Amino acid sequence: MQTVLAKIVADKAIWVEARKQQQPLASFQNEVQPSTRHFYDALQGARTAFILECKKASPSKGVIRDDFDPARIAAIYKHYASAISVLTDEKYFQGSFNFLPIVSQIAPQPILCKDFIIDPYQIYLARYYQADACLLMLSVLDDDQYRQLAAVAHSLEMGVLTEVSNEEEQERAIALGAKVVGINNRDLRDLSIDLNRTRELAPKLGHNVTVISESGINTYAQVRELSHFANGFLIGSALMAHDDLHAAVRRVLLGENKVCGLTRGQDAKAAYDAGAIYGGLIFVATSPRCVNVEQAQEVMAAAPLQYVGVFRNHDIADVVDKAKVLSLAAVQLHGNEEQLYIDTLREALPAHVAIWKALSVGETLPAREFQHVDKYVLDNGQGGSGQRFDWSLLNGQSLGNVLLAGGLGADNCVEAAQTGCAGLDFNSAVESQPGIKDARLLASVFQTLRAY
C-alpha cells in the first residue's frame, strides 16, 4: 500500500509534466525576476510570528471553506500575519497558482507558496506568480534534491520553509543548514496529528534556526504554551472553517476575550477594534451598568461583536425574549441558576444561543458539572467593581471552556493571560466610570494579550 503522501506526490508529478507542456519553462524563465520581499526577515523578531494560511480544502477535511475568496481572506489576514501561506496544489487543497498574485496585491507581507515542490520548474513558476518563499519537504526530497531546489529558491531571492515531520528529518535539517524549519505536527503519510512533534523536536533545532510549528493549532492556550518551543505558527484550518475571519483570527492569536458591561456603541467599537471577541450587555436591574433593550440595540449596532446578555435569576420568558429580539450569541447566568432552570432555559431558547454560567470562587473552586452549559465565567464575584481570586486554584482543571474574570486590567493582564484559560473577561478595571470604557486601557490590554 501507498501512503497518502506518496499518492499526492505521485499526482503532483503528473500535474508538473502536464503544466510544462502547457507553459514550458523556456517561455518565461528569462522574465522571472527576484522577489523583493523578505521572508526570512519577517519571521525574525521579538514576538512570536504567525504565517496565516489561505486554504480551501485539505486532504483530511475535504472542502473547508465553500465560501472561498483569496482576496477577501488576504484583506483580513494582512492585519495580523508576519507572512501569508497560499496553497497552490489544486487536487488535494483546491488551491491555484493564480491566487498568489491576488493575495500579493492585497497584502504586503511575504507570500509563501505552499505545495509539494519536487521540480525546479515549480519554483520558477511560483516566482513567476509572485511568490516570495516556497515550502520544501524533507519527507519528499533527498538531500541532493533539496540543495538543488533550495539553491534555485535562493537564486531568486526567495525564502525557504524547510518542513520536517520526524526525528530523522530534523537531523537532516540541521545538517543541511536550513534557516527556517517548520515542524509539521501532522504526518501526511497517515494524517495523524500530534503536537508532541513540536514539543520534542523544536528544542533540538537551536537558537540559530527559526522554528515554525505547523498544524493542529486551534487555541490561544496552545499558542501560549507552544511559543516556548517554537518561534512561530503556520495556522489555516482553524481559521478557514469560520465565516467571521477576523473573529477566528483573534480567537487564536488573542484568546476568546470579552469586554463586559458595555453601555455605549463607541465602547463596543473600541472593544472590537482592539480585538475582543465578545461584548457583554448587563440586564441585571441592580447594575449601574444595566441596559434596556433599546439601549442595547444601540450598542450593538456599533460593532460586529458576539454579544452576551448577562442575567441574574431572571425570568425565563424574558431571557428568551431578549435573546430573540437582540439576537444575542449567548446568555450568561450570573445568579444561582441550578440545573432545572438551565434545562428549561435550554429547552426554551433557540438552539443557536449558547448558555454560559458564571461562578464565584472562594477558597475553593466550584465544580463545573452542569449539563447544557457551553462556557463558564470564573470570577471573585457579586460583580465586584473590584479585585481578584486565587489563580493557583486553577491547576489540575480543564480550562478549555473557561473565561477568567475578576479585577482584570492593564496592570495584571500579563499574569492573567498566562493562567491557561480560554479567555479573559474585562469589566471595571478598564473603565473611567462605571459603564464607561477607557479606550486607551482597552487598547493596552489587547496589546498585552499579543505580546508573546
Swiss-Prot record:
<comment type="pathway">
    <text>Amino-acid biosynthesis; L-tryptophan biosynthesis; L-tryptophan from chorismate: step 4/5.</text>
</comment>
<keyword id="KW-0057">Aromatic amino acid biosynthesis</keyword>
<comment type="pathway">
    <text>Amino-acid biosynthesis; L-tryptophan biosynthesis; L-tryptophan from chorismate: step 3/5.</text>
</comment>
<comment type="similarity">
    <text>In the C-terminal section; belongs to the TrpF family.</text>
</comment>
<feature type="region of interest" description="N-(5'-phosphoribosyl)anthranilate isomerase">
    <location>
        <begin position="257"/>
        <end position="452"/>
    </location>
</feature>
<keyword id="KW-0413">Isomerase</keyword>
<dbReference type="GO" id="GO:0004425">
    <property type="term" value="F:indole-3-glycerol-phosphate synthase activity"/>
</dbReference>
<dbReference type="InterPro" id="IPR001240">
    <property type="entry name" value="PRAI_dom"/>
</dbReference>
<keyword id="KW-0822">Tryptophan biosynthesis</keyword>
<keyword id="KW-0456">Lyase</keyword>
<dbReference type="InterPro" id="IPR001468">
    <property type="entry name" value="Indole-3-GlycerolPSynthase_CS"/>
</dbReference>
<comment type="similarity">
    <text>In the N-terminal section; belongs to the TrpC family.</text>
</comment>
<dbReference type="InterPro" id="IPR011060">
    <property type="entry name" value="RibuloseP-bd_barrel"/>
</dbReference>
<dbReference type="Pfam" id="PF00218">
    <property type="entry name" value="IGPS"/>
</dbReference>
<comment type="subunit">
    <text>Monomer.</text>
</comment>
<keyword id="KW-0028">Amino-acid biosynthesis</keyword>
<dbReference type="InterPro" id="IPR013785">
    <property type="entry name" value="Aldolase_TIM"/>
</dbReference>
<protein>
    <recommendedName>
        <fullName>Tryptophan biosynthesis protein TrpCF</fullName>
        <ecNumber>4.1.1.48</ecNumber>
        <ecNumber>5.3.1.24</ecNumber>
    </recommendedName>
</protein>
<dbReference type="InterPro" id="IPR013798">
    <property type="entry name" value="Indole-3-glycerol_P_synth_dom"/>
</dbReference>
<dbReference type="GO" id="GO:0004640">
    <property type="term" value="F:phosphoribosylanthranilate isomerase activity"/>
</dbReference>
<dbReference type="InterPro" id="IPR045186">
    <property type="entry name" value="Indole-3-glycerol_P_synth"/>
</dbReference>
<dbReference type="Pfam" id="PF00697">
    <property type="entry name" value="PRAI"/>
</dbReference>
<comment type="function">
    <text>Bifunctional enzyme that catalyzes two sequential steps of tryptophan biosynthetic pathway. The first reaction is catalyzed by the isomerase, coded by the TrpF domain; the second reaction is catalyzed by the synthase, coded by the TrpC domain.</text>
</comment>
<keyword id="KW-0511">Multifunctional enzyme</keyword>
<keyword id="KW-0210">Decarboxylase</keyword>
<feature type="region of interest" description="Indole-3-glycerol phosphate synthase">
    <location>
        <begin position="1"/>
        <end position="256"/>
    </location>
</feature>
<dbReference type="GO" id="GO:0000162">
    <property type="term" value="P:L-tryptophan biosynthetic process"/>
</dbReference>
